[PDB]
Amino acid sequence: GFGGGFLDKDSVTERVLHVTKHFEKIDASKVSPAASFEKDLGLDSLDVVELVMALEEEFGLEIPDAEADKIASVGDAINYICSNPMAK
Amino acid sequence: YPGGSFWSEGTQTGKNGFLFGEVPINGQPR
Amino acid sequence: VKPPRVFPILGSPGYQFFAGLWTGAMLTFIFTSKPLGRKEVEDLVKYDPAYFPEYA
Amino acid sequence: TSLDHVFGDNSNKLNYNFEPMGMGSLFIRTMVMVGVFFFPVFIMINDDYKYTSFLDKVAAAKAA
Amino acid sequence: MPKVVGFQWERYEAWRHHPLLQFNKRNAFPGVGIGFAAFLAYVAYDKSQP
Amino acid sequence: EPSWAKQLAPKSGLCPPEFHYNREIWYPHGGFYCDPKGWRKNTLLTLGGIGVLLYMTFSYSTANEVRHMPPKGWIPSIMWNSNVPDPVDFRGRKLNRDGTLPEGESS
Amino acid sequence: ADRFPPPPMKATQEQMDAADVPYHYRDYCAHMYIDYKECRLTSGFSWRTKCAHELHAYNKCEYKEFKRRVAIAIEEKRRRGLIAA
Amino acid sequence: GAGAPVKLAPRPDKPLPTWYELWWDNGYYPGQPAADFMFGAWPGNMTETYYLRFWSVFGLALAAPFYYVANFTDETRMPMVPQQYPAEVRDVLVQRRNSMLKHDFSAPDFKEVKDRAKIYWTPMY
Amino acid sequence: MFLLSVFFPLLGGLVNTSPIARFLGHRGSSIIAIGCMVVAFISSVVIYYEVVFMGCAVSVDVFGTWFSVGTFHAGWTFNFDLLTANMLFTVTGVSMAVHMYACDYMRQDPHLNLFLGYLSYFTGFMCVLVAADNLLVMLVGWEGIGVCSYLLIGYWSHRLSAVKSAQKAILVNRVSDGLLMWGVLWVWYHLGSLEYDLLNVYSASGFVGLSILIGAMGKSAQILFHVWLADAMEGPTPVSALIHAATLVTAGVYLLVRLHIHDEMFVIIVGSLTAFMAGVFGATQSDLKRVIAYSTCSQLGYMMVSLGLGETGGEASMGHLMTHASFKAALFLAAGMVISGNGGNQHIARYGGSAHSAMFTMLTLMVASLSLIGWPELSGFYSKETILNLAAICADPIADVAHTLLLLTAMLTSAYTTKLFYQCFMVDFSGSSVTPVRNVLPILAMAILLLDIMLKVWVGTNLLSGMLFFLPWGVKTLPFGLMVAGILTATAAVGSERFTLIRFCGSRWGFDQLFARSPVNPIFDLGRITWAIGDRGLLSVGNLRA
Amino acid sequence: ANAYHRTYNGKPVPPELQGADYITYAGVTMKKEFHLFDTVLSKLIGAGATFTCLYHFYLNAEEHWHGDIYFFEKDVQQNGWD
Amino acid sequence: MASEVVLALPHKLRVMRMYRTGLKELINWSANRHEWYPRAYALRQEFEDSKALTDREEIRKKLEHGEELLARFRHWEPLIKPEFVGGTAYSINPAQPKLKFIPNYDAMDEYKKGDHL
Amino acid sequence: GVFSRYYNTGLLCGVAVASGISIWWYNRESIYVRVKSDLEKEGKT
Ligand SMILES: CCCCCCCCCCCCCCCCCCCC(=O)O[C@H](COC(=O)CCCCCCCCCCCCCC)COP(=O)(O)OCCN
Ligand SMILES: CCCCCCCCCCCCCCCCCCCC(=O)O[C@H](COC(=O)CCCCCCCCCCCCCC)COP(=O)(O)OCCN
Ligand SMILES: CCCCCCCCCCCC(=O)SCCNC(=O)CCNC(=O)[C@H](O)C(C)(C)COP(=O)(O)O
């Protein structure tokens, strides 16, 4: 394997970009790392709640609520997942 | 399993801990 | 709520109606079947001329 | 604090004042406990009372 | 009548209905045909004709 | 590294490489993922000692078993025990030690 | 139980002691119980086919006793007035 | 999977409550009360008043049928008498207070056998 | 062969926990444990055929006298009669398969040989319990399985909830152990001996049967004592299988069947209330192991009612114990395999399909589930129908309500067992981990228990199988209809809108929460009074300042 | 490892996971694998359980269609009493 | 009603936590995930019918009623992933912390290893 | 679970159907009479 309990940056980036594109309003070409959920992508707060719950499902995590409040962009999600030792 | 099977050699040599915290000094008897 | 994809008959209205029908019938058989069985057991011998010829 | 973003932080505190129970609640629950866990004592006391009242009836109706 | 609002969950999790992830009805009752055939052979051997 | 660390056993091939467990502690049962080098020989020798104990307790059990009633047929304890009484069947008839009806009512 | 009196016992005390019949099975079908126990405890796995007659006869005797017990109950209730005659 | 991460519990950095030994701090996060549900929120946010209120009906709903059959129904409901025995077999079988043969209302000593099956507690002298 | 069924699992435990195991390791200790159980099972098979079929009981004076002061005489003596042979066959046969399973299930545990030694000690103390001929060696077995249950429930000691579950099991059983000890005092005082063959009671002083019943209600987890049983799921899956099949929970029922000194009203009411309560409890759980735990509690209620019915009922009670152990151990082993195939998840909302398990695990769950729900001409059909038909002809009016409670319980059991199969395999997949287990040792462990399920049909437990208690076709075939009703309801997956009843039942009637403050917090507060107000206060004598 | 492989982001399937042995559905590939010991032991034990059920049901079919009462009453009336 | 933590939140995060906990409680009360999907869609449509509000009193009344509903329908047996807090696999076999060792303690200062008096 | 009105209607229909079956069970002939008539019917074959 690789890493001291943490997943690599590239595969986490690929999986987060896969999860993010599952909206009707989203144009796929705008989905990139370090892209804002509201300003750049055009998702409201309920869409962000659903996206973080889907990322919880994707990486097998129970993300604490204060941490899920802080996630506001693709790069924030990638940086959070790469700091989880329990992320599978 | 080490060696690819249940019926291989073991993989530990030496003290598996120290009984009563006693460590041999220069190989001398206690 | 959709049924499982390999068992779509379990979500059918007829199947749910039949399950309710059988369950309700068995639940009330639970309460009725004891004195009816006891009366049947008594009537096995009561109408026997070998035991009680007065009752035929 | 290296795992607080994984399992939660220490900010939320326990809401309990570590105070004793109220006096009436303690008395009532203790009396219920005495009645439940010491029921042979009450059974045997009732046996002694039922036995001595019968001997009272015998001694009353016998000397008349 | 809108229901595709707020993170399409069916499309994201459409892999749950993989044919190798479903209940398999070919091997749902293993050996029951063999036991039934042996029972029929026993009945024809013992009870019907003798 | 400490001076006494060279005398210690390594973490075995059963133990995950990222698991840490303080190898200096002497556990009476063996400890974390115990896998000694000569374990197959030790297993054979302990099986031999267990077989010795098995024979000893089989002999003690056979010497101290008391049967207050005769059995109703042949039992496998007749083969190794001489204190087993002769079988007496369900009708009260005395039987042979091999569990067959004696002559006069057999065949 | 005078109208439906018990049948004679066909098994003696010594016969029930020899078969080690449990004391709550020492009723008016004890001889059939002895036959059934003797057949089943020595027949091994295939007891249902080669001890079918002994089990059937034991259950038939218990059926006769069951019918007598129903008749005794009917006569007792008739004497108490609980069932009109 | 041995060696999974687990969060540690902080040490006290403030004055302790007088009755602090009602919290179980084993070293890892989170600790627990000494007995579960003694304090803190109960599962499902239920309370003691909830359970006592539902039980004040549900307990008599379960004790109702036993009382009715033990006080308003007797041995004569059965369509048959108990299993019949010879006198030498029966006379020891009905010595047990435990036995179901004392419900034989066709026995000549039915009352006396029932009067001998009364449970006592203190053995008299 | 007779002493080899009792000594030799204790020998396996002694080997695997001592410093001999430092030379064997995991690999050698697994061999030692499996062989030490195979020998004891072979000995128990010989004992079973000699005592049950050929009727020759054997009494062994093992280690002389234990203690003898005045007329209180306790000896180290065994007696192997019909009940003892039944129990030894059942315990050793289940524990052999559980050892074969545990040598593969706990392979990645760091202290595997310690776990195997604890399992062997637990089995050996159960054998000592059933092989004893007097009450005091029975108490050795009783407290030995209690201690080993504490060691095995709280095995993962770094988890606080497991430690508290083990402490809870100890304390709940300690109440009933106290009552059982007082009952032993009553029995010895008013009969003069401790040996079972001299304890023939026709009419005793009421406290005897009541206190022995309370002591049995503790171990068999009846009403107001069931609270420890559900929390004992903190331990690993082999511990749960051995607790719920052969050891521990069957000990109180064995004691009541052996002694037969109860008063039937308490026994019938406790058993039927327990059966209905555990039936409704298991219908509203989503933890896969907790449903099986509550089904164990429900079947123990059935056996309690049966031994209330009479001597024939006592035989039927022992028969249901014997057939229950096999399919209950099989159910727990199959559930452990399903849990391991789904990444450790125990919630039945995250299962589905036929990819996370072997074909044999699904077959094992199906066959043991069919035996549990009383499917015709399987193992549980004979014993459960015998108890139900014996309860339908009892002349006690109390048994009328008990029979109705048992029939409702039968429908509930066929509901939640079918729900356990339906959620696990029939619905669409809703987990995310597929690692199916197909090792040889757990598959053979399951196959052995399925062979015992077949054996109970082919060779009965006692002579009751095939005896006809004469009932009409309506009374006789109603439990089959109740089984079908449970199956149809559970496959329809229907639910009710009465959410307050759902949350009252799913929270298990609030017994734990009410016990958290009706005795427990008052005990703590009375301790505060006795220390602070008494020792430091009213009785304290101060100093004289000068 | 895990029994299914996932793709993500519209990537091509890796070439080792393609052919007549693998099934891909909505971006997830699984392998059609046959296990011999599991299949043989399950079929043998299942056939034993099926025969055990069916044989004992056949031996008691008349007492299961009718009840105890009817079957033994017909036996008494047709084939004598004692 | 919400806890003292949720009552301290900003309004946007308060509504977000209410929607998130509603989705999780719908998971807890459902039999499967495939049962959960249309209930999740219905809960989303329920929040969309109050998006265009401006009156803070009506917003407060709807928010407080929904928080009362979530306090009522808190499941007694929540679904937790096993390796997290409240899960079944949390805190089982952690790696040992470093514990210090003292070699040959009995041999250090022999004849003087008791308690003083 | 599934909240089904077909199941709820089936529950009451089943209660009614088995009440009618119980009424039919109460007014049935004795098993002695049923067996005797069944044996008389078989004896003309
Ligand atoms: C921390 C807790 C650990 C728990 C440990 C397990 C649980 C133990 C519970 C019960 C403990 C009882 C131990 C008693 C020890 C010996 C007491 C008897 C002393 C003595 O001289 O008796 C003679 C010794 O015989 C013999 O001893 C037999 C002779 C040798 C042949 C068999 C050898 C023993 C093999 C055992 C294998 C492993 C078993 C493990 C228990 C027997 O004669 P008597 O004078 O009593 O006369 C009467 C019959 N003749
Ligand atoms: C139903 C009711 C039943 C009642 C049953 C009652 C049972 C008795 C209970 C108590 C029995 C034990 C009595 C002695 C307890 C002593 C407690 C500690 C005392 C202590 O620490 O001693 C010194 C202080 O107190 C002192 O100086 C203590 C002096 C000795 C106390 C007793 C003698 C008092 C004088 C005798 C005459 C009493 C009057 C008779 C009418 C220390 O002092 P230090 O050396 O540190 O300080 C010197 C600088 N000044
Ligand atoms: C078991 C089921 C329990 C039921 C749970 C409760 C269900 C009730 C739900 C209905 C109650 C409500 O809508 S609660 C009232 C919610 N409506 C408002 O607050 C007015 C809108 N104001 C805003 O600031 C934003 O749009 C905001 C939406 C907050 C954020 O979205 P964005 O940042 O993108 O903008």
Automatic annotation (TrEMBL), chain A:
Q: Where is the Carrier domain?
A: 10-85
Q: Does the keyword Transport apply?
A: yes
Q: Name one GO molecular function term.
A: acyl carrier activity
Pathway recorded for this protein? Lipid metabolism; fatty acid biosynthesis
Transferase as UniProt keyword: no
This protein's source sits in the domain of life called: Eukaryota
Principal location class: mitochondrion
Compartments where located: Mitochondrion
Q: Which UniProt keywords apply?
A: Electron transport, Fatty acid biosynthesis, Fatty acid metabolism, Lipid biosynthesis, Lipid metabolism, Mitochondrion, Oxidoreductase, Phosphopantetheine, Phosphoprotein, Transit peptide, Transport
A GO CC term assigned to this protein in UniProt: mitochondrion
Q: What does this protein do?
A: Carrier of the growing fatty acid chain in fatty acid biosynthesis. May be involved in the synthesis of short and medium chain fatty acids. Accessory and non-catalytic subunit of the mitochondrial membrane respiratory chain NADH dehydrogenase (Complex I), which functions in the transfer of electrons from NADH to the respiratory chain.
- Protein family per UniProt: Belongs to the acyl carrier protein (ACP) family.
- Subunit comment: Complex I is composed of at least 49 different subunits.
The name this protein carries in UniProt is Acyl carrier protein
Q: What fragment of the full-length protein is this?
A: 41 to 128 of 128
Automatic annotation (TrEMBL), chain F:
Which region ranges are annotated with the description Disordered? 89-107
Q: Tell me where on the tree of life, at the top rank, the source sits.
A: Eukaryota
Q: Spell out the PANTHER family in the cross-references.
A: TRANSMEMBRANE PROTEIN
Q: What is this protein called?
A: Uncharacterized protein
TrEMBL record, chain G:
Q: Which family does it belong to?
A: Belongs to the complex I NDUFB7 subunit family.
The protein here is known as: NADH dehydrogenase [ubiquinone] 1 beta subcomplex subunit 7
- One matching Pfam family, short form? NDUF_B7
Top-level taxonomy: Eukaryota, Viridiplantae, Chlorophyta, core chlorophytes, Chlorophyceae
Q: Which is a Gene Ontology cellular component entry for this protein?
A: mitochondrial intermembrane space
Q: How does it sit in the membrane?
A: Peripheral membrane protein
List locations, semicolon-separated.
Answer: Mitochondrion inner membrane; Mitochondrion intermembrane space
Q: What does this protein do?
A: Accessory subunit of the mitochondrial membrane respiratory chain NADH dehydrogenase (Complex I), that is believed not to be involved in catalysis. Complex I functions in the transfer of electrons from NADH to the respiratory chain. The immediate electron acceptor for the enzyme is believed to be ubiquinone.
Chief localization: mitochondrion
Q: Name the keywords, alphabetized.
A: Disulfide bond, Electron transport, Membrane, Mitochondrion, Mitochondrion inner membrane, Oxidoreductase, Respiratory chain, Transport, Ubiquinone
Listed InterPro entries: NDUB7
Q: Which PROSITE patterns match?
A: CHCH (PS51808)
The superkingdom of the source organism is Eukaryota
User: Which molecular-function annotations from GO does this UniProt entry contain?
Assistant: oxidoreductase activity
Coiled coil segments of this chain: none
Disulfide bond positions? 29-61, 39-51
Automatic annotation (TrEMBL), chain J:
Q: Which domain of life is it from?
A: Eukaryota
From the broadest rank down, the organism's phylogenetic lineage runs: Eukaryota, Viridiplantae, Chlorophyta, core chlorophytes, Chlorophyceae
Name assigned to this protein: Uncharacterized protein
